[PDB]
Structure formats: C-alpha cells, structure tokens
C-alpha cells in the first residue's frame, strides 16, 4: 500500500476532493534514497486531478490524506506504484526494426505500435549482433518508491 508520514503540517482543514486538481512540489526517491524525479528541479509545480487515476494509486490514496500546505513522505509498494516486472514484456527484435537516426544504443527508447493503435515505449537493454533486446516493462516496475510531496494548493 502507501504509508503516509508527515514532514511538516498543513492547515488541517482543506483536503482534496474527487475531481479537484492538486498542485504539488515533489522529490521522488528509490528505497535507498537515490533521486529519480523532481518537480522542484524543473522549477514547475506538478498538477493532477484527484480520482482521475492519472497518477499511481499510492498518490491518489496518499495525497487524499493531506491538507493544503502539508508536506508528507509517501512510501509506496510496487503494486501501488508502477507494478511488478513481467518477462512477457522483454522481447527481441532485429536491427531491421530500428529505423531512427544512427545506430541502436543501450538505453534508447523505441516506439512500437500497440494493439490499441497507440505507440508504446520500449528501452533497448542489450544488443547482440543483429538482435536487440527491448524491455517494455515500466522502468520502475518492482521498486518501492519514496516521495516527498508538498500540497501547494487545490484548483478547479
């Protein structure tokens, strides 16, 4: 699930409601403390709509417990974040299928046409001669995440 521990308190009265837009500043860290995301580093607060499920479940449930002005530490298990890894999402492709500029590189994102018609991203993990290993698992799958979240305000 998601554990919520206060860093500094909010107003204790104004709590997010379904359909409102939350405006937050956050730092994202792996379980060992290594930073992987930050809205402060972008000089730009991050917005999402409560109940829209456009952020991970741990954020929906965790931020719903915060009052405006509050800063809290959200510890989120993988099943409440970006899932667990699946070997079905590690596939092998010929260099023939790489058609972007240059040669394929480790860590490059390749866009493939999904069954729904959208383009889904895969990350090159290995190159073995003509065979490219592409991982379609979310890069953070199976990892517990720790977020320092500040609820700056609520919008309509």
């Amino acid at each position: 699930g998601v554990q919520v521990e206060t860093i500094s308190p909010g107003d204790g009265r104004t709590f997010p409601k379904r359909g409102q837009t939350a405006v937050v500043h956050y730092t994202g860290m792996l379980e060992d403390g290594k930073k992987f995301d930050s809205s402060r580093d972008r000089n730009k607060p991050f917005k999402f709509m409560l109940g829209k499920q456009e952020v991970i479940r741990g954020w929906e449930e965790g931020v719903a417990q915060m009052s405006v002005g509050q800063r809290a530490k959200l510890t989120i298990s993988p099943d409440y974040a970006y899932g667990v890894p699946s070997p079905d999402l590690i596939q092998y492709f010929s260099r023939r299928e790489f058609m972007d500029a240059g040669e394929p590189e480790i860590g490059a994102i390749m866009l493939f046409t999904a069954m729904d018609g959208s383009e889904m991203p895969g990350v090159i993990r290995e190159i073995n001669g003509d065979s490219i290993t592409v991982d379609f698992n979310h890069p953070l799958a199976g990892q517990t995440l720790v977020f320092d979240v500040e609820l700056l305000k609520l919008e309509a």
Side-chain angles (χ1 to χ4, degrees), residues 135-146:
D135 192 340
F136 292 102
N137 290 278
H138 190 285
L140 297 173
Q143 300 196 238
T144 293
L145 310 180
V146 181

Side-chain angles (χ1 to χ4, degrees):
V2 54
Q3 306 165 249
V4 179
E5 297 173 272
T6 297
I7 294 157
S8 52
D11 76 356
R13 304 173 194 262
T14 311
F15 293 82
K17 301 288 171 289
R18 173 164 174 152
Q20 296 184 318
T21 287
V23 185
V24 310
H25 259 322
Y26 70 92
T27 305
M29 296 158 281
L30 303 177
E31 215 178 342
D32 71 340
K34 167 181 146 202
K35 185 176 82 193
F36 69 88
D37 194 7
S38 168
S39 60
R40 302 187 185 280
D41 292 355
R42 295 192 293 273
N43 296 133
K44 166 143 185 149
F46 180 80
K47 300 182 182 191
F48 73 97
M49 188 176 306
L50 279 295
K52 181 103 187 148
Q53 294 185 0
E54 66 183 346
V55 297
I56 56 172
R57 182 178 190 181
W59 267 49
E60 295 280 18
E61 177 171 330
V63 173
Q65 299 172 50
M66 297 172 69
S67 58
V68 174
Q70 188 182 356
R71 198 176 160 199
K73 177 187 155 196
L74 281 53
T75 299
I76 303 174
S77 60
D79 54 306
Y80 274 56
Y82 292 105
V84 294
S86 176
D88 294 317
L89 272 51
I90 296 170
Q91 288 158 223
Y92 310 93
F93 298 94
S94 164
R95 291 186 173 246
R96 199 202 59 196
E97 295 203 35
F98 181 94
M99 287 164 291
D100 303 312
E103 289 288 325
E105 302 184 12
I106 307 306
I109 287 79
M110 287 181 71
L111 302 175
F112 282 82
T113 304
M115 284 291 290
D116 52 10
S118 74
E119 47 181 5
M120 66 183 152
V123 182
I124 293 177
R125 313 291 288 171
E126 293 184 299
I127 299 158
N128 294 289
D130 181 72
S131 178
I132 308 174
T133 307
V134 174
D135 192 340
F136 292 102
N137 290 278
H138 190 285
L140 297 173
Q143 300 196 238
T144 293
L145 310 180
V146 181
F147 288 90
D148 162 8
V149 182
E150 181 187 21
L151 180 58
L152 300 167
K153 49 177 295 191
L154 294 165
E155 297 181 341

